[PDB]
Design a protein around this ligand. Structure first.
Ligand code: SF4
Ligand code: SF4
Lengths: 70, 176, 156, 318, 364, 144, 100
């Protein structure tokens, strides 16, 4: 009956779910377990560039904390 | 004696005007139609699982013609040609000669299923219940020539379907 | 041979694709169109089998000649058949379309649609019951299943 | 890995389109007391494969004989733009994060009409050319309201950035704020996607097949895929714009599930509408937009400009 | 001829389904000629059979038995329900509704089952014949008809819910195909086409043919003469047909189903097999047929698509000399051009739908 | 709740068809996984089931045999495979199954039902059943 | 480079499908198959253009709401919207909106 429609909807649901989960996890993998930083304004990009210089491995997601000080 | 469809005047009171304005702006009637379709979605479908499930038929069904025999095995048809006369599409061609036993039998009985209209005549005319449209309906063919039946084909159909045909005639012979 | 095996499996695949998705064209001249619609009706719904009515001859795969084919209508029927892409199959429904039926001796009736276009499956009846039409369509599907196009190509 | 992300966006969307076809068929059947395709595979799951293979193996007719370059570009443009419009959508993190992704999607939708425009013309037929013209008018007519309604609702977002829509609707759906705009926007999506009751373009009952009457086998399949991909994408845009979803930053899966379910609901609504209502007459279609909708959209745009000022609810720009 | 989407000139070309029916009738006996009338209007077969039966009976000066007449009126109303279902649902399909098609075609399948039970043919049966009806109703059929009719009202109500008050549906039909009452009368329109314009004429009341004088029903009358009013009339006529069906179910008489005259109606099988007179008459009836007294008549009935008439002239032989069929769709398709003026293509589709035209009737 | 009951009924359907393998078998062959009372089985192997609870038109159904008349019918099944005795029960022409009410036994009746043979070497070929009408003169064999 | 990559990939994929659908199935062996009125209603299209211009003029409004002279901004925004409404009303009343 009407439940027979459900399997196609479920396959479509999985297919639609795949890209969002893929994007989230790819961002996590590329940005070191943190969300990809969002730079909608030049100040945020300047912060990202400063982090890249500070990291020393030329990767912004690498974060240097109080340990680098003194 | 007569009824007026339409011919109704809407009320002009503020409540009725507000209701109709709501219907126009808020799409109420469209929502009602949508709800009807939704209910039909949740209703059980009427499809039968052909070929595993077959549509109902009555004993008087008119399908593939089938020449029948007597219980002794002698072919019932007695070359009366009454069927050829009533045939409204002249799909029946009958030729007869006295057979060796001396009985009046048909040397040729051809029913062109490509010209026949499945009227049910002949079945109601044959004085000896010879040609009787059988219950079979799924006898489609891949070539035109297969549908030009011969007396041998009709007798084979009768032999094949006699078990059902006799029962159907028994069911309906009192109504006739 | 391995090549024969690959060819046979590919032909099975293409035949299955063609028979599963049979798109008849919305072509009904006379009474048998009513029984055709009843086949499309919920009881014997053709869409379960992959049979979907598509108006465009260019987007259609099977032509069901449901009705009496008159001399005036015959050239149009031939034209619509020709504009239909291949593989194309023709199913003749009704005594009128098969051989002229009730109007076989009419001056204005083509005595069978086989004279105008080739016919693959003939569905007897006047009108053929919708179940008979569905049976004819399934017989056409089996006929497609038996096709050996790629096998014959490999054998040459 | 960015190419991997592109493929992950593209291929599943195409598979979703393929199975959306089956879903449509079964839903329409059940609302018509019928059963959808079920012979081909368990519960009909293999029907789209059969349909695609049958289409591809079918004869490639082409009596266009005019600007074959255009006759080939039109399917390419349609499919490419349908795939591209999915890119900026945040689900919840967008593939490409644009400050103006909304205007990007509007521009891509406007461009996608050229696919119908060229296909019908390069076909060089009667129904094809006139049907293509009717298409231009339809999409063009509703593009106006689409933009106005979109601007009116984003006045609360504070930007054209799609991602911030999640933040704006964190506490409540924007449908509660702008349901009249939501209704008009939904009808607008229906018109833009050329779906019933506005399926005038193809318009099988009136025009044999419309702009795709001279397109067969694969190019017709690409037009079908573009159409259905546009349907899913527009419903996803509706879901993001109005039916916002909770997003936990640490677990994006919850938002992704909620968003996918809402988009599925809206697509099922599209099929439901296709089943219920008959088709609007070409003339009535335009009458409903320029004379009936366009006004109310202007009034609501004035209101949605005025409300943040008089309620001191101007959203933050960033 | 279309300027833009406006129809400047609408010219109907017919004969694509002309099968020379009237010519072929001359070469057949009356009983052989009966099956053609089933084919003439495929949606309303039994009504055409009844019209031909009335013509041959009137020329024959023979009267059908009362039970045959009540069976005829019952199946005439069943046929009217079928025809209206097809007309309203296919009109809706052509303008894009599409769902009521399947909804009501399930009921059509059930009514076809009733046809099959009486005659053995789902459609194009030979049930109604000169002199009455071929076979009596199989036991248990009437109660099944009761079961069907008691629920058909909900189905037609659901159809109204889908279409009657829908804004789109009204916009497609509220004022298209307007016909003046005098223009409708002059152009030869009949049935709803007349009643939609507001003229009050139903042959079932004005000139009752079989037992319609003994049944109570209301003729639906429209007020603006448009497609929407015709839609309303068709739906109401269906409701009144359901009422007539209830009445006929309640008061079906007992007795014979064909005239007790073996020179016109064939004798019963047992009688033809046991009595010499019955066999002689059976032989002559199924070979030569019954001679009709010479004369001519035009007998008209309120067929579901309008007035259906047969101008039957007899030369005293067993085969009619001339048989002219008046198809209600002929005049409607003729006036299609007048109706279409000032309208667009889609409106032309709607007008074609409103004139319930079956081209078997038009072409003959 | 009734939903749990429906799920358990689905599990009962899985069990009743002989397990998961039989469930998949009937699902792929017939597209229907209902379990019904087995009324009987013809000689050819077709099994006939009845479920009066289902609405009219689905209360009776047949599972076609995998092999009939030397043809593999696991996937290719046809309506003609139904023998005439069970045909009337299947198509609702009678309410009594052939097992309950056997058909009358006659010598001429076929003992093995043949399905539609079109497209096969067994296909019927039309031919005239009458002998030559005009007989020609036979010339004499002597030179003169 | 990300947006350029996306554009390239999508275009190439669609064009690849068009190739596999215009040439790949064209190999399959077959045989021979043989084989405007001046729209004055285009005025609607022209009016769309002049309305699309106002559409463009209205897009900056979300950032326009961030100014300190909100009074002037609101007055000018409503001025543009009222002029658009006046244009629509004029075309409506002068039967200029003669669609189809
Ligand atoms: S059913 Fe066919 S064969 Fe029999 S009398 Fe009628 S037309 Fe002739
Ligand atoms: S075969 Fe019978 S039902 Fe079919 S078109 Fe001819 S007369 Fe009509």
């Amino acid at each position: 009956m009407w439940f027979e429609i459900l399997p196609g909807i479920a396959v479509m649901a999985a297919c639609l779910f795949i890209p969002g989960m893929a994007t989230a996890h790819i961002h996590k993998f590329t940005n070191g377990g943190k969300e990809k930083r969002v730079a909608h304004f030049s100040y945020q990009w300047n912060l990202m560039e400063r982090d890249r210089c500070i990291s020393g491995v030329n990767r912004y997601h690498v974060t240097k904390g109080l340990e680098n000080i003194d | 004696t007569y009824k007026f469809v339409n011919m109704r005047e809407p009320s002009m009171d503020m409540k009725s005007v507000t209701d109709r304005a709501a219907q126009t702006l808020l799409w109420t009637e469209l929502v009602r139609g949508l709800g009807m379709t939704l209910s039909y979605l949740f209703r059980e479908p009427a499809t039968i699982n052909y070929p595993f499930e077959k549509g109902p038929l009555s004993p008087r069904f008119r399908g593939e013609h089938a020449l029948r025999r007597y219980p002794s095995g002698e072919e019932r048809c007695i070359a009366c040609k009454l069927c050829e006369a009533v045939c409204p599409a002249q799909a029946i061609t009958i030729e007869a000669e006295p057979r060796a036993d001396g009985s009046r039998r048909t040397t040729r009985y051809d029913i062109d299923m490509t010209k026949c209209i499945y009227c049910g005549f002949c079945q109601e005319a044959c004085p000896v219940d010879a040609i009787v449209e059988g219950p079979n309906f799924e006898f489609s063919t891949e070539t035109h020539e297969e549908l030009l039946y011969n007396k041998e084909k009709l007798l084979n159909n009768g032999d094949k379907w006699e078990a059902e045909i006799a029962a159907n005639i028994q069911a309906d012979y009192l109504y006739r | 041979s391995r090549g024969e095996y690959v060819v046979a499996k590919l032909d099975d695949l293409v035949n299955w694709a063609r028979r599963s998705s049979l798109w008849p064209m919305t072509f009904g001249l006379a009474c048998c169109a009513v029984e055709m619609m009843h086949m499309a009706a919920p009881r014997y719904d053709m869409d379960r089998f992959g049979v979907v009515f598509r108006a465009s001859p260019r987007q259609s795969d099977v032509m069901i000649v449901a009705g009496t084919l008159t001399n005036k209508m015959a050239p149009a029927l031939r034209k619509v058949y020709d504009q239909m892409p291949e593989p194309r199959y023709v199913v003749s429904m009704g005594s009128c379309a098969n051989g002229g039926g009730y109007y076989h001796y009419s001056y204005s009736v083509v005595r069978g649609c086989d004279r105008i276009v080739p016919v693959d499956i003939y569905v007897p009846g006047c009108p053929p019951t919708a179940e008979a039409l569905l049976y004819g369509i399934l017989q056409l599907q089996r006929k497609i299943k038996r096709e050996k196009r790629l096998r014959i190509w490999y054998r040459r | 890995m960015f190419m991997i992300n592109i493929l992950s966006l593209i291929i599943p969307i195409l598979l979703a389109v393929a199975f959306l076809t089956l879903v449509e068929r079964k839903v329409l059947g059940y609302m018509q007391l019928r059963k959808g395709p079920n012979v081909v595979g368990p519960y009909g799951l293999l029907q789209p494969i059969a349909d695609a293979l049958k289409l591809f193996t079918k004869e490639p007719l082409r009596p266009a004989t005019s600007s074959i370059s255009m006759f080939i570009i039109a399917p390419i443009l349609a499919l490419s733009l349908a795939l591209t419009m999915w890119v900026p959508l945040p689900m919840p993190y967008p593939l490409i994060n644009m400050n103006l992704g909304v205007l990007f999607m509007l521009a891509m939708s406007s461009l996608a009409v050229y696919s119908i425009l060229w296909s019908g013309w390069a076909s060089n037929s009667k129904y094809a050319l006139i049907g293509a013209l009717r298409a231009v008018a339809q999409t063009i007519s509703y593009e106006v309201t689409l933009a106005i309604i979109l601007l009116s609702v984003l006045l609360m977002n504070g930007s054209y950035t799609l991602s911030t829509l999640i933040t704006t609707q964190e506490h409540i759906w924007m449908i509660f704020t702008s349901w009249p705009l939501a209704m008009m926007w939904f009808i607008s999506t229906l018109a833009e996607t050329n779906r019933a009751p506005f399926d005038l373009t193809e318009g099988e009952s009136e025009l044999v097949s419309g702009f795709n009457v001279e397109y067969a086998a694969g190019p017709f399949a690409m037009f079908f895929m573009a159409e259905y991909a546009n349907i899913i994408m527009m419903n996803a845009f509706t879901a993001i714009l109005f039916l916002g979803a909770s997003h936990d930053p640490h677990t994006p899966e919850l938002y992704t599930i909620n968003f996918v379910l809402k988009t599925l609901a809206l697509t099922i609504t599209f099929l439901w509408i296709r089943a219920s209502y008959p088709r609007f007459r070409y003339d009535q279609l335009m009458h409903l937009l320029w004379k009936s909708f366009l006004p109310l959209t202007l009034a609501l745009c004035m209101w949605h400009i005025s409300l943040p000022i008089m309620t001191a609810s101007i959203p933050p720009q960033s | 001829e279309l300027s833009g989407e406006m129809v400047r000139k609408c010219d109907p070309h017919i004969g694509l389904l002309h099968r020379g029916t009237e010519k072929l009738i001359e070469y057949k006996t009356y009983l052989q000629a009966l099956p053609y009338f089933d084919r003439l209007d495929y949606v309303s077969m039994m009504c055409n059979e009844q019209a031909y039966s009335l013509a041959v009976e009137k020329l024959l000066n023979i009267q059908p038995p009362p039970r045959a007449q009540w069976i005829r009126v019952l199946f005439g109303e069943i046929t009217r329900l079928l025809n209206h279902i097809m007309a309203v649902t296919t009109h809706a399909l052509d303008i894009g509704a599409m769902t009521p098609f399947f909804w009501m075609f399930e009921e059509r399948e059930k009514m076809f089952e009733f046809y099959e039970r009486v005659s053995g043919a789902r459609m194009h049966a030979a049930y109604i014949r000169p002199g009455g009806v071929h076979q009596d109703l199989p036991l248990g059929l009437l109660d099944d008809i009761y079961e069907f009719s008691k629920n058909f009202s909900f189905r037609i109500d659901e159809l109204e819910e889908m279409l009657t008050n829908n804004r789109i549906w009204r916009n497609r039909t509220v004022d298209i195909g307007v016909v003046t009452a005098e223009d409708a009368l002059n152009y030869g329109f009949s049935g709803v086409m007349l009643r939609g314009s507001g003229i009050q004429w139903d042959l079932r009341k004005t000139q009752p043919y079989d037992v319609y004088d003994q049944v109570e029903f209301d003729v639906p009358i429209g007020s603006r003469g448009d497609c929407y009013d015709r839609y309303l009339c068709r739906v109401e006529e269906m409701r009144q047909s359901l009422r007539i069906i209830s009445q006929c179910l309640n008061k079906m008489p007992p007795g014979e189903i064909k005239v007790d005259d073996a020179k016109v109606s064939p004798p019963k099988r047992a009688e033809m097999k046991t009595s010499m007179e019955s066999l002689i008459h059976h032989f002559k009836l199924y070979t030569e047929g019954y001679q009709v007294p010479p004369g001519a008549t035009y007998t008209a009935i309120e067929a579901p698509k309008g007035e259906f008439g047969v101008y039957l002239v007899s030369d005293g032989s067993s085969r009619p000399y001339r048989c002219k069929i008046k198809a209600p769709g002929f005049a409607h398709l003729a006036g299609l051009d007048k109706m279409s003026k000032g309208h667009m293509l889609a409106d032309v589709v709607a007008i074609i739908g409103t004139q319930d035209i079956v081209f078997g009737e038009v072409d003959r | 709740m009734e939903l749990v009951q429906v799920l358990r009924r689905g599990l009962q359907q899985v069990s009743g068809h002989g397990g998961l393998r039989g469930y998949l078998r009937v699902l792929f062959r017939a597209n229907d996984v209902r379990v019904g009372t087995l009324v009987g089985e013809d000689k050819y192997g077709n099994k006939y089931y009845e479920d009066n609870k289902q609405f009219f038109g689905r209360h009776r159904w047949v599972i076609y045999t995998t092999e009939m008349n030397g043809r593999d019918t696991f996937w290719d099944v046809d309506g003609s495979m139904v023998p005439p005795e069970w045909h009337r029960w299947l198509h609702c022409m009678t309410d009594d199954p052939p097992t309950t009410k056997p058909p009358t036994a006659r010598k001429y009746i076929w003992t093995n039902h043949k399905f539609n043979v079109s497209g096969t070497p067994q296909q019927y070929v039309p031919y005239s059943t009458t002998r030559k009408k005009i007989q020609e003169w036979v010339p004499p064999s002597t030179p003169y | 480079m990300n947006i350029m990559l996306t554009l390239l990939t999508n275009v190439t994929l669609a064009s690849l499908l068009v190739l596999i659908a215009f040439w790949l199935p064209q190999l399959n062996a077959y045989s021979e198959k043989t084989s405007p009125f001046s729209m004055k209603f285009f005025l609607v299209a022209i009016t769309f253009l002049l309305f699309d211009l106002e559409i463009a003029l209205l897009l900056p409004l979300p950032w326009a709401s961030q100014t300190n002279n909100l009074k002037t901004m609101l007055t000018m925004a409503l001025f543009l919207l009222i002029l658009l409404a006046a244009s629509l009303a004029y075309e409506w009343t002068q039967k200029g909106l003669e669609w189809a």
